Design a protein around this ligand. Structure first.
Ligand SMILES: Nc1ncnc2c1ncn2[C@@H]1O[C@H](COP(=O)(O)O)[C@@H](OP(=O)(O)O)[C@H]1O
Ligand SMILES: [Ca+2]
Lengths: 718, 102
C-alpha cells in the first residue's frame, strides 16, 4: 500500500500542514501520527513513503524502531523524506521540473538525493522548509521517485484559463480598443507554447452599454473577434443565484445571457460556468445545477469553497447531477482590482501569485487547473495579461509537463481518471462555516441535523431502542421512508451522492415542530467502510449508539432474517455449511456468508466507527440487558445523552410475557426459533474466538459497559 | 483622465534626425511604459519607469528614446534615418499618432 507515513510534531504545525496540504492536493494517501508504531501488518507493505517533518525524529528515534525501519527499508524499498537556485539537469527525477554517495537536485543543494550505501535505500533530505515554489516543485518528484513511480502525477497537464465578469463595469472600469487587441494578440502569440491555448470568457449582457464612448468601442470590437476565442456562460444581471430560489427567475437570467450569446456570435459548445463569489455551489443548490444543465448543458463547473474557503490546498472536486465539479483557485484577481496600484495588497501582491503563489500551486500539485479573474483586470491596466503571460512563461521555463489547453469536458474527464477517490463527494455542515451560510440560500433553516446516530448492526435490538426513545418528551424521531422505512440508508450507500438537502428532507422543520432533537435508525451503517468518514464529515457532533449481542445468535438471526425476507440462499442451504464455506462455493452462498458472518465481527466495525468519532460519543450496549431489564439501560442512555427532563422508564415500561422483553413492538424483532447444532456452535465459537477476545479488550479499552454475554462466552475460552 | 499627445515629423530623405515628443497629460510618464510603436504596429522602442531601454535590431544603433520628468514628456531622439522608418509613431502607455516622412 502507498500509505505515506508522516511524523509530525503536533497537529497545529505549520510545516506539517504544508506537507499534508501538498499530500491531499496531489491525493497522496496519508495517516497523521505524532513522532515517537506497527511498521508492517502481517508481513505486508503497509507503508511506501516515510516523510519526517523534523530530521531529528528520524535521527534520534528508538534503536529497536530504527533497526526495524532499516530492515523494512532494505527488504521492501520505501522512500525516506526528511525536512531540516537552479535545478540539476542530470537527475533521475526530472520528469516534472525543467532546468532554467549522493547526487544533488537543486544545485551543495537544499534538496539532495542519496543513492544508498550507508543504509542501502534512496532518500531525499530537504534543507529548507516548504515556503518556496521550487521546493514544492521538486518535492512532487521526490515523492514520485522515492516510491518507484507508484505515487506520481501524469505528464499531461490540462490548464483552463477562465475569465469571469465580462461586461460588468459601470463607468470607467471596462476594456478599450488597445487592451482588447492586445488580448487577442496575447492569445495568438502564446498559442505556439501551448496548443490551442485561449482565454475562456464569462460574459454578462446587462452591463454591456453602461460604459463611455471609448469603453463601448472596445467592447464592440470583440464581436468580430469571436472567431478565435473561448467564452463560457454566466448570468445577465451579475447577481448571486442563492437569491433566485425559483427555476424561472434564474433560468430567465441565463436565458437572457443565451440571447446575448447567440446575438453576438458567441459559441455555447463549451460546457463551463461560474457564479459570482461561487454562490449555491457548495452547499449544493438544486436550482443552480438544474438551471445549468437545463439552459446551458453545463457538465463542468468550478468551486472555491470545498470543504471550506480557507485554505485552497484542501480543495476537491465531485460529480453531482451529472456535473463534474472542479476546484477553483483564484490568482488574486478580484472585481475590485482596477489599476496596478488599486490592487488589494499592492503591486507586489500580484507578483507574489505569479512568482510562486496560488497559480503555481494550482498547476503543480493538481494536474488540472482552473483560474479566476475578471474583465476589470483586462481594461484600464491589463493586469491579467501580464499575470497570465508571466505565469505561462514560468510554466514553460520551469516544467517538462506537456500542457495543452483543451475544452473543459475532457479536462474534467482527465480530472476524474487521475483522481478516482475524488469522484465521490463529501458533505459538511453549512452552519459551521459562516461563509457557507451566506453562500447558501436563506429560505431553508439551519437546525434540521440530528444529534443521535444509530449505526446498528441489524438483529440486535436497534428498533426497540429506537421506538423506546421516541416516547421521550425531549426526544423526537424522523420521518419514515417508503422502502427503507426507519432506515435512511444515506451514509453507507449511493444516497450520499444526492446532496445535503436530501438528508434534510427526512427530518422535520425546527420551527413547525417543538422538539429539535432528531435521530434515525439506519442499522446497516455498522457493515460499511465509507459511512463513518462521511458521517463524521457531515455530522461531527452527532453521538453514535451501537448494541451488541452474541455473534452466533446474531448470525443465526440474520440467517432467519433472510429466511423471513424470502432469500432463497437461506431457504435452501443449511447454516452449518454456511459457517464452514470456503473458496469453492457458489456466488449466492458466498454473498450470504459475506452478509451473515462478516458483520458479527464487532471489533473491525467498531474500529471503523471509532476512528472517526470521539470516545465519549460512542456508547456500546449489551443486548441481554435490553432483554432482561431495559429500563436501567435507558437510564444509562439518558445519562449518556444528557437530556433536560429525565422521565422514569421503570414506571412506563413493564414486562410483557408474549414478547419476552419488557415493553408494543413489531413481530420482526421478536421471532421465535429453535436452537443450533452442537458442532455448529463449536465451530462458531472457534470462528468467533479472536473477534470475542479482541472485542473484550476493545470494549474494556474504551472504558464502557462490559457485556454479560461477553463475560459468559469469555469464561468458556479463558 | 489618461491622455497621450504626440508631435514631431519630417526629415532629410537621405537621412536626418528628429526628437518626437510624447506628452503625458493627466498622469505621470515615469509610472508607465511609453513604448513607441510604428505602423501593423511594431514596437521599436520602450523606456521603463526606472529608465531601462529596449530596442529592436533595426533601430538599435540609431534611435535614442529618453524621458523627462519635469515636463512629463518622453522623447524619442531619432538618428540616421533610413527610408524604411516612415510610419505613424504611436506612444502607448494609446495616442493619436504622428507621421514621419523620410
Ligand atoms: N429489549 C429488546 N426488545 C426487542 N428485541 C431485543 C431486545 N433486546 C435484544 N433484542 C434482540 O433484538 C433482535 C432484533 O433486533 P433488531 O431491532 O435490530 O432487528 C432480536 O433478535 P431475534 O428477535 O431474531 O431473536 C432480539 O433477540
Ligand atoms: Ca464576478
Amino acid at each position: 500500500d502507498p500509505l505515506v507515513l508522516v511524523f509530525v510534531e503536533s497537529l497545529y504545525s505549520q510545516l506539517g500542514q504544508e506537507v499534508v496540504a501538498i499530500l491531499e492536493s496531489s491525493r497522496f494517501k496519508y495517516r497523521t501520527e505524532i513522532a515517537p508504531p506497527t511498521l508492517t501488518d502481517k508481513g505486508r507493505g503497509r507503508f511506501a513513503l516515510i516523510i519526517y517533518e523534523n530530521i531529528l525524529k528520524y535521527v534520534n528515534l528508538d534503536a529497536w524502531n530504527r533497526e526495524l525501519l532499516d530492515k523494512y527499508c532494505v527488504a521492501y524499498g520505501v522512500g525516506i523524506i526528511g525536512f531540516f537556485c537552479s535545478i540539476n539537469p542530470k537527475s533521475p527525477l526530472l520528469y516534472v521540473t525543467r532546468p532554467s554517495t549522493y547526487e544533488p537536485v537543486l544545485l551543495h543543494a537544499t534538496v539532495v538525493q542519496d543513492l544508498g550505501l550507508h543504509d542501502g535505500i534512496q532518500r531525499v533530505l530537504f534543507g529548507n522548509n516548504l515556503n518556496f515554489w521550487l521546493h514544492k516543485l521538486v518535492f512532487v518528484d521526490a515523492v514520485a521517485f522515492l516510491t518507484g513511480k507508484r505515487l506520481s502525477l501524469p505528464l499531461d497537464r490540462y490548464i483552463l484559463v477562465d475569465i469571469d465578469d465580462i461586461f460588468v463595469g459601470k463607468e470607467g472600469t471596462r476594456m478599450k480598443v488597445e487592451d482588447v487587441k492586445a488580448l487577442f494578440d496575447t492569445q495568438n502569440e502564446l498559442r505556439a507554447h501551448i496548443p490551442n491555448f485561449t482565454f475562456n470568457l464569462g460574459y454578462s449582457g446587462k452591463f454591456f452599454h453602461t460604459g463611455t464612448n471609448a469603453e463601448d468601442a472596445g467592447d464592440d470590437l470583440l464581436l468580430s473577434y469571436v472567431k478565435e476565442f473561448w467564452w463560457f456562460p454566466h448570468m445577465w444581471s451579475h447577481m448571486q443565484p442563492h437569491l433566485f430560489h425559483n427555476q424561472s427567475v434564474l433560468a430567465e437570467q441565463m436565458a437572457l445571457n443565451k440571447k446575448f450569446a447567440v446575438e453576438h456570435g458567441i459559441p455555447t459548445d463549451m460546457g463551463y460556468a461560474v457564479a459570482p463569489h461561487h454562490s449555491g455551489v457548495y452547499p449544493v443548490h438544486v436550482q443552480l445545477y438544474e438551471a445549468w444543465k437545463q439552459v446551458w448543458s453545463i457538465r463542468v463547473t468550478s468551486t472555491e469553497e470545498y470543504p471550506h474557503l480557507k485554505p485552497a490546498r484542501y480543495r476537491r472536486g465531485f460529480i453531482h447531477n451529472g456535473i463534474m465539479v472542479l476546484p477553483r483557485q483564484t490568482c488574486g484577481l478580484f472585481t475590485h482590482t482596477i489599476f496596478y496600484n488599486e490592487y488589494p495588497g499592492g503591486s507586489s501582491e500580484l507578483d507574489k501569485i505569479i512568482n510562486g503563489g496560488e497559480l503555481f500551486l494550482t498547476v503543480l500539485l493538481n494536474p488540472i487547473s482552473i483560474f479566476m479573474t475578471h474583465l476589470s483586470n483586462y481594461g484600464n491596466d491589463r493586469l491579467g495579461l501580464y499575470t497570465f503571460k508571466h505565469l505561462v512563461r514560468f510554466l514553460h521555463s520551469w516544467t517538462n509537463l506537456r500542457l495543452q489547453t483543451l475544452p473543459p469536458v475532457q479536462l474534467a474527464q482527465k480530472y476524474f481518471q487521475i483522481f478516482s477517490e475524488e469522484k465521490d463527494p463529501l458533505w459538511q455542515d453549512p452552519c459551521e462555516d459562516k461563509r457557507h451560510k451566506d453562500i447558501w440560500s436563506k429560505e431553508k433553516t439551519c437546525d434540521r441535523f440530528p444529534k443521535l446516530l444509530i449505526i446498528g448492526p441489524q438483529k440486535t435490538g436497534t428498533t426497540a431502542l429506537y421506538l423506546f426513545l421516541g416516547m421521550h418528551p425531549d426526544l423526537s424521531s424522523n420521518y419514515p421512508s417508503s422502502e427503507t422505512f426507519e432506515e435512511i440508508q444515506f451514509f453507507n450507500g449511493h444516497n450520499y451522492h444526492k446532496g445535503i438537502d436530501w438528508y434534510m428532507e427526512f427530518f422535520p422543520i425546527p420551527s413547525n415542530t417543538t422538539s429539535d432533537f432528531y435521530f434515525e435508525k439506519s442499522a446497516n451503517y455498522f457493515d460499511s467502510e465509507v459511512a463513518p468518514r462521511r458521517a463524521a464529515a457531515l455530522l461531527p457532533k452527532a453521538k453514535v449508539l451501537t448494541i451488541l449481542i452474541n455473534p452466533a445468535d446474531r448470525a443465526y438471526s440474520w440467517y432467519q432474517h433472510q429466511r423471513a425476507h424470502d432469500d432463497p440462499v437461506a431457504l435452501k442451504y443449511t447454516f452449518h455449511e454456511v459457517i464452514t464455506a470456503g473458496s469453492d462455493a457458489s456466488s449466492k452462498l458466498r454473498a450470504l456468508q459475506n452478509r451473515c458472518l462478516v458483520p458479527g465481527w464487532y471489533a473491525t466495525h467498531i474500529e471503523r466507527w471509532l476512528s472517526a468519532y470521539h470516545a465519549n460519543q460512542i456508547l456500546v450496549l449489551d443486548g441481554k440487558l435490553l432483554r432482561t431489564e431495559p429500563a436501567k439501560v435507558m437510564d444509562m442512555v439518558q445519562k449518556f445523552l444528557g437530556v433536560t427532563n429525565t422521565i422514569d422508564y421503570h414506571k412506563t415500561l413493564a414486562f410483557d410475557p408474549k414478547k419476552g422483553f419488557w415493553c408494543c413492538l413489531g413481530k420482526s424483532k421478536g421471532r421465535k426459533y429453535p436452537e443450533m447444532d452442537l458442532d455448529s456452535r463449536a465451530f462458531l465459537k472457534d470462528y468467533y474466538r479472536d473477534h470475542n477476545i479482541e472485542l473484550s479488550k476493545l470494549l474494556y479499552k474504551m472504558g464502557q459497559t462490559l457485556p454479560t454475554w461477553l463475560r459468559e462466552d469469555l469464561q468458556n475460552t479463558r | 483622465q489618461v491622455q497621450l499627445v504626440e508631435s514631431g515629423g519630417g526629415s532629410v530623405q537621405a537621412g536626418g534626425s528628429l526628437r518626437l515628443s510624447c506628452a503625458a497629460s493627466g498622469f505621470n510618464v515615469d509610472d508607465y511604459a511609453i513604448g513607441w510603436f510604428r505602423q501593423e504596429r511594431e514596437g521599436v522602442s520602450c523606456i521603463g519607469g526606472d529608465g531601462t531601454t529596449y530596442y529592436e535590431n533595426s533601430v538599435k544603433g540609431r534611435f535614442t528614446v529618453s524621458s523627462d520628468k519635469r515636463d512629463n514628456t518622453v522623447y524619442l531622439q531619432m538618428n540616421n534615418l533610413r527610408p524604411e522608418d516612415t510610419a505613424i509613431y504611436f506612444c502607448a502607455a494609446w495616442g493619436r499618432g504622428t507621421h514621419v516622412t523620410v
